[PDB]
From a paper:
The crystal contacts are similar in the crystal structures solved in P321, [name] and P6322 but differ in the H32 space group. In the ligand-free crystal structure (form II), the inter-dimeric and the catalytic interface areas are 1711 and 1554 Å2, respectively. Analysis of the B-factor distribution in the apo BsPNP233 crystal structure shows that the loop connecting β9 and α7 as well as the N-terminal portion of α7 present the highest B-factor values, highlighting its intrinsic flexibility. As this region surround the active site, its flexibility may be important for catalysis.
Residue numbers in the entry:
A (entry chain D), B (entry chain F), C (entry chain E), D (entry chain C), E (entry chain B), F (entry chain A): -7 to 232
């Protein structure tokens, strides 16, 4: 190929049978996938370079864990999640990413566990028409993560998020969503939760606050990096 | 009035401030409201008879608790939940009701805790248009309920439900909903969860299975009554 | 059961074959069902106590008439109307209820006969998708009611209503509906008219004004009660 | 102009103030407008030739009546009805046209009076969004027409119709519409009823059967023409 | 018939096979169809008088060309285009009409070639539901028209238009459409392009400016008539 | 930062304003952006490494050109296009990518120029509601591309495409879209064309066939690489 190609079984992932673990962390940024795998895992290998969307496999306290970049937005993560599920038999899928907080009571240091997500994606209206489908986290994964946070005293907030198609949106309804108690905005959760459930696999999204969208309250690198480490510790402890 | 009238502040509830507790159990059937209050609570008073939609307040373990029938469907529960929240300052709202199970893996003895609900009600499209709003349980209540169930060894399943407008529906999508992991069908949760969140109150729906919609298999009175009691016990332990 | 159970053939109505008349009046309030049956009919029997949603049968000038509370909202009346039609072979279904007036020209003393109803329920979009279905009264019933009113001099207005899902609605379009000539808001007619037509039965909604929703002009008990009497007289004279 | 031009106040009608009566019959075919005016009215003048969409004014038993072709479809009739209402102060608008019957029980000789109409036009969703708006005939006009038919012994049916955007429609739902009681299909009524009501004017559609859509039962010229004459006689008598 | 009838094969066109050319110009105004045929073509015959929607066939530099009025709006043109395509085997369909300009940069003398059209017609949502279908001109016709205009120095602008259902529309989104680059508003192109494409025929809409919608800046007869002649010259040269 | 960060002015592009050209080629795959820049351009520098979404700038025959990976799907390309337009004042935006052909008449060697795109993205319904917005290519770029292809003898097809949200879609309407003349499926064009038009910039999507969706017929490496090189050659000649 002119550039790396996927496998016949997975057009966007150039891996073979067995190279991807049953449990996969899913950051949006493939360079964060790299950073996570190299910083937290042992015996790391890169199994995918197709489209520069790096995927890695290594071990955490003897258990195989993969870390796969998803890109941004429902259509991008849907491609990777479908291929992970259908071609690599992945069982547990945990997004680890950022969100923009939309309520003042959402604190910079809180690790957010998404129970569900609202969206302006049409993906579920395409499937259900007049039905509003509410995606749902796997409770076992969510509870294990909450327990991992609580056991250490890591601040954790459990609620809902909004999965946006338009990062830049002149027609945003973030103010109203915040009034209805939605915690923050990201670009992946609705797809991860819907596709995992449709195929009987377990999904969870863990998120940290990268900014406060409505107040412009600033975040610092120290705050963001500490909370990021807590997020990855929670994700890994919860599956251990 | 020709029949009992609501109060000026609450057109559908004939009570006065203080007569309803800050925690209210919400069965759909006002005769189950009566049964619950008289069976489980002490020193019970009926504070509402408007439209025969009985509401009661009594004592459980040193606190006042109320039990208010809601009727069936999003529009009916919305009227009672709005009035309880806005006129009686209710803080914790816990639906206790039945659902039709739509998956083989949902057992007759399972107490269901709804994380979220899908719907064919237009109530959220009316507010949000192109946005699919995903209603969300209060996790504090949900986790307390889960912990109460686990403490006794009551079987508990945590996931999503479908809030139907049409109990009889030629255009039902319950097969597809079940494929997407939805546990069962009921007629209230979307409204309870959306309105509680909009007003910063805490809600949870606890459900027991009254029938298996897709396999057709019937429940026994012994199965239903056992699980009903388990649901009420769990409910009475959902608020810290 | 712990509380009254429906019959096998009608989950929400605990009656047997023959106990319900072929002509049924449908107030929303089951206590008004009781008031109507006991005040206007002879030899009254209560055939349903399931969910406290009382239904009665008696005679009016030798004709059997039933009066069945429906509860509030499209989902609730849909349950009762489906069971009445499919399980008890009911032929004539006449709602007798209240509405909030939305036009200054609608007088508190006018009995309203609904030709059709607009709605924000999704029930018909669930069935028809891109089609806007316009529910339609049975003209024979409507004509007979109009003639009954005119023969005595009872004030009568014929036009359309709006069937709301949300009695409390921050996103109401009642101002625009009034500009388009809609008379008032209630919570049942769309379902009654659509379901009766689907099954080839005759329906009509007769309504009286409980409130002036936009002008804030209040109604008195004397006005409401006289007009209620006129409504029931029109319903019964019209079927005689 | 290269061809006849509308007036400054009415882009599609080349008339002056006063040339159009306050009561206007609205056939879809401008040649039927000519036929009706010439055959039924005295001292006929043609007030419009713009776009060949003929409009005429004459007298029937001394009352001024106009007959204006509308063309086919919601957008075409909307142009004429808006201009008639807004620029010529028209008060009573009565469509006289054809429909395709969609029920076996609709008889070829029955004159149809439309109480309301369903549609697949987006015109009302454009205005109301999540609301299904149900257009409504003026009851005074409808009742006058019904009484004129009964007085003259003309067979008459009253019910609802469907206003189609697509005369040829691979995605038609007319079989389902017929099951819900809809009598026939035409292409104008939703716009006439909605726009007349929006401006506080009176409208009615009277229709005769030109075709049996679902059965291909045949109609004859003699049947069609006799019933057409009945329709026009009903329209004119109802207005005098 | 009381007035002219269509043929059995084409309900709205009273012609026989062979009488209509494989290339048809489609003005909305049948009097403009007449003007075009009589002014530009030789040996003209009128093949249709049904509903006064005149169609003509003649020759231009020896080539058979038909000119068929369409009426206004998606439903009217859809009737004529369906019949032309399905009953008369028409291959090339070129609308020649007017539009209201919605941008300052669209000049009164510019001949507009529409690449595509937006709409508020539901015709494509009826077919595709959640999909936004974008109708597309045949590029060969478009390029031939472009080349014909350039050859003479006739000013030409290529871009998109908006096909409106409501010429008079209180809920218009013209301002937003102009911001997204849409050139003008007309009432036919979406239907023409969609139906031509569905049947593998070639379509193009050529348009001239009759009005500036947002500024009320005036056009004169001399401007409109000169540009009209340019439009017909481009259409005919382009098929020569 | 833990990984590369965007500029304050462009959250997802870590470049200084002067590092990006006024003309940007937009492949979905950032490794194809690398290949394009290294293969075709002189004096190449990489200006972005944020999220591994590489962007490069060099010269082609003396003209400054950038090549920026967009990722897959409307939300991803919308981020990059908004930042290019708003923060780097990019004027010409040309997607160079793959599509799945959906018609037998689309040949493997055909370079496709998209005039417009349909979609199942909700992005335009979010903005326009009841309006179907049809995105439009810049005709100047399209015509230059067409002219360049013809000059070289590269087979070119001009028509419409479908912008999918779901690469894997159980509810796909590909068969119907092909019937309506749509050429192929990709995941970016609607966003590119909509956002460029909204901001008065010029856009075009050029596409090559990666496979035949509906016949399973595969392409070969030699076919794909030949046509890729044709596409880039054409693109490098689309700006006037």
């Amino acid at each position: 190929g002119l550039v790396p190609r996927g496998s016949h079984m997975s057009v966007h992932i150039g891996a073979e049978k067995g190279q991807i673990a049953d449990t996969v962390l899913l950051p949006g940024d493939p360079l964060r996938a790299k950073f996570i795998a190299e910083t937290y895992l042992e015996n790391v290998e890169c199994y995918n370079e197709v489209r520069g969307m790096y995927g890695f496999t290594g071990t955490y306290k003897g258990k195989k864990i993969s870390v796969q970049g998803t890109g941004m937005g429902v259509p991008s993560i849907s491609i990777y999640v479908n291929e992970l599920i259908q071609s690599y038999d992945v069982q547990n899928l945990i997004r680890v990413g950022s969100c923009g907080a939309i309520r003042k009571d959402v604190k910079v240091r809180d690790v957010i566990l998404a129970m569900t997500s609202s969206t302006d994606s049409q993906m579920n209206r395409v499937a259900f028409g007049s039905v509003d489908f509410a995606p749902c986290a796997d409770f076992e994964l969510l509870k294990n993560a909450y327990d991992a946070a609580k056991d250490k005293g890591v601040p954790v907030t459990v609620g809902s998020v909004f999965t946006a198609d338009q990062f830049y949106n002149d027609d945003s309804q973030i103010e109203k969503l915040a009034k209805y108690g939605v915690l923050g905005v990201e670009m992946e959760t609705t797809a991860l939760y819907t596709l995992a459930a449709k195929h009987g696999r377990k999904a969870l999204s863990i998120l940290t606050v990268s900014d406060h969208v409505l107040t412009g309250e600033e975040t610092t690198a120290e705050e963001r990096q500490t909370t990021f480490h807590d997020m990855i510790d929670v994700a890994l402890h919860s599956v251990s």
